[PDB]
Amino acid sequence: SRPGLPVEYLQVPSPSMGRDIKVQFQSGGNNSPAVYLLDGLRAQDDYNGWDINTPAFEWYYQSGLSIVMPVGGQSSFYSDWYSPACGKAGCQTYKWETFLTSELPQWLSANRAVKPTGSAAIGLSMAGSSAMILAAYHPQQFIYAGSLSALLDPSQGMGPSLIGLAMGDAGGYKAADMWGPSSDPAWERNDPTQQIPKLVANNTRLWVYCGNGTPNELGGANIPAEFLENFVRSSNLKFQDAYNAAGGHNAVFNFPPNGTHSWEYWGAQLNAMKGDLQSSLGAG
């Protein structure tokens, strides 16, 4: 149903960020695997864009999988920032890696019986690289990573620069506060293409999607959505080449001759990945 599902709005304390993080949540059942649905660049502080734009909880009710949607973190790249995340409206502490890899799984396990290991992380936009990085450095916790329309080589060439422009545009943040100047090692640490050997070694299940910038009847036919998607697609095709070349063998590569940087396309992916998640995480 859309109304009528056991969807919760959790207030999860984050010691490292100094506030309570809101978390939209739907249990899978006790000891169910978790699917963390990470939000895009312009993540709002009230509801996660997955909830807003898709019937995600509805699609995943009774699938055997807990759906976890952290709320907030516009421009955070779900990372632990070097410095305070200061933007238009003010400053906040961004320690999202810490929260997603210790604070939240521990609270979800203690308070909701969500299995803390063997999870998937799925993100779109800024969060697609985040998902792969979560898995790269925390493979016990994240055994599956989905990346929808992300820039997968953010440390290379014009990427540090483009990322800074995006962050400016979404909230008025500064990339330097996050990962420092582009010379800082944090750039390569958080670049999924540079972390391929870790993904490969950990045999992480990858679901990698990117459209080609051509909308279809599904919609999303606006210039920004089209330009954005076409733009991030080269990093995606290179990732695929590098992954295979490094001996990668547990990924789905979805690069259709359509799709724009829009929720019509992303929602479709999340719907299409449900049986793959169930098999890979052990739902039922």
From Swiss-Prot:
EC class (word): transferase
Annotated substrate binding sites: 41-42, 125, 153, 231-234, 238, 261-263
GO CC entries: extracellular region
GO molecular function: diacylglycerol O-acyltransferase activity; trehalose O-mycolyltransferase activity
Active-site residues, as the UniProt record annotates them: 125, 229, 261
Compartment(s): Secreted
Catalytic activity: 2 alpha,alpha'-trehalose 6-mycolate = alpha,alpha'-trehalose 6,6'-bismycolate + alpha,alpha-trehalose; an acyl-CoA + a 1,2-diacyl-sn-glycerol = a triacyl-sn-glycerol + CoA
Enzyme Commission designation: 2.3.1.122, 2.3.1.20
Keywords: Acyltransferase, Disulfide bond, Secreted, Signal, Transferase
Gene3D superfamilies: alpha/beta hydrolase (3.40.50.1820)
Disulfide bonds: 86-91
Superkingdom as given in the UniProt entry: Bacteria
Positions of the UniProt region annotated as Fibronectin-binding: 57-67
Pfam families listed in its UniProt record: Esterase
PANTHER family named among the record's database cross-references: DIACYLGLYCEROL ACYLTRANSFERASE_MYCOLYLTRANSFERASE AG85A (PTHR48098:SF1), ENTEROCHELIN ESTERASE-RELATED (PTHR48098)
Family: Belongs to the mycobacterial A85 antigen family.
Function: The antigen 85 proteins (FbpA, FbpB, FbpC) are responsible for the high affinity of mycobacteria for fibronectin, a large adhesive glycoprotein, which facilitates the attachment of M.tuberculosis to murine alveolar macrophages (AMs). They also help to maintain the integrity of the cell wall by catalyzing the transfer of mycolic acids to cell wall arabinogalactan and through the synthesis of alpha,alpha-trehalose dimycolate (TDM, cord factor).
Record's protein name: Diacylglycerol acyltransferase/mycolyltransferase Ag85B
Annotated gene: fbpB
